[PDB]
Amino acid sequence: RKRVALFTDGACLGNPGPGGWAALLRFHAHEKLLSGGEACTTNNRMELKAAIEGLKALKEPCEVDLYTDSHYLKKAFTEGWLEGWRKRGWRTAEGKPVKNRDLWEALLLAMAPHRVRFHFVKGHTGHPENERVDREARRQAQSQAKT
């Protein structure tokens, strides 16, 4: 292992809109921050695409501390929600195919090698490392196509 420190944030500017994410991998002694942005999307996908790319970029099964201000991620993981989607081939109990299921499995695949404890600290309750992500998420979202 070796305790990593995954800070995450995603920003979006419409519903849908252009958004960008960011993942910060606070290593033993050095950071590595990944940031992308899609043109038309949503907060939830941008907050989620953020958590997965963080994980993705770790070929070394480590203990992970993940962190997110995600309204949506905290929902899905704490309220029995996700365990259910899993079970039904990604289907709602009403009988429909859960929204954002491409990102949902994605994530699951990502966690795979590692042992991630999540940390739902409502945005900035976290460390200054919060600042970096936050800004780079915003930044990403602001430098796209407005289409």
Curated annotation (Swiss-Prot):
<dbReference type="InterPro" id="IPR036397">
    <property type="entry name" value="RNaseH_sf"/>
</dbReference>
<feature type="binding site">
    <location>
        <position position="9"/>
    </location>
    <ligand>
        <name>Mg(2+) 2</name>
    </ligand>
</feature>
<dbReference type="Pfam" id="PF00075">
    <property type="entry name" value="RNase_H"/>
</dbReference>
<protein>
    <recommendedName>
        <fullName>Ribonuclease H</fullName>
        <ecNumber>3.1.26.4</ecNumber>
    </recommendedName>
</protein>
<feature type="binding site">
    <location>
        <position position="134"/>
    </location>
    <ligand>
        <name>Mg(2+) 2</name>
    </ligand>
</feature>
<keyword id="KW-0378">Hydrolase</keyword>
<dbReference type="InterPro" id="IPR012337">
    <property type="entry name" value="RNaseH-like_sf"/>
</dbReference>
<comment type="subunit">
    <text>Monomer.</text>
</comment>
<feature type="binding site">
    <location>
        <position position="69"/>
    </location>
    <ligand>
        <name>Mg(2+) 1</name>
    </ligand>
</feature>
<keyword id="KW-0540">Nuclease</keyword>
<keyword id="KW-0255">Endonuclease</keyword>
<feature type="binding site">
    <location>
        <position position="9"/>
    </location>
    <ligand>
        <name>Mg(2+) 1</name>
    </ligand>
</feature>
<dbReference type="InterPro" id="IPR022892">
    <property type="entry name" value="RNaseHI"/>
</dbReference>
<feature type="compositionally biased region" description="Basic and acidic residues">
    <location>
        <begin position="126"/>
        <end position="139"/>
    </location>
</feature>
<keyword id="KW-0460">Magnesium</keyword>
<dbReference type="GO" id="GO:0004523">
    <property type="term" value="F:RNA-DNA hybrid ribonuclease activity"/>
</dbReference>
<feature type="domain" description="RNase H type-1">
    <location>
        <begin position="1"/>
        <end position="142"/>
    </location>
</feature>
<dbReference type="GO" id="GO:0005737">
    <property type="term" value="C:cytoplasm"/>
</dbReference>
<dbReference type="InterPro" id="IPR002156">
    <property type="entry name" value="RNaseH_domain"/>
</dbReference>
<dbReference type="InterPro" id="IPR050092">
    <property type="entry name" value="RNase_H"/>
</dbReference>
<dbReference type="GO" id="GO:0003676">
    <property type="term" value="F:nucleic acid binding"/>
</dbReference>
<dbReference type="GO" id="GO:0000287">
    <property type="term" value="F:magnesium ion binding"/>
</dbReference>
<comment type="function">
    <text>Endonuclease that specifically degrades the RNA of RNA-DNA hybrids.</text>
</comment>
<keyword id="KW-0479">Metal-binding</keyword>
<feature type="binding site">
    <location>
        <position position="47"/>
    </location>
    <ligand>
        <name>Mg(2+) 1</name>
    </ligand>
</feature>
<dbReference type="GO" id="GO:0043137">
    <property type="term" value="P:DNA replication, removal of RNA primer"/>
</dbReference>
<comment type="similarity">
    <text>Belongs to the RNase H family.</text>
</comment>
<feature type="region of interest" description="Disordered">
    <location>
        <begin position="123"/>
        <end position="147"/>
    </location>
</feature>
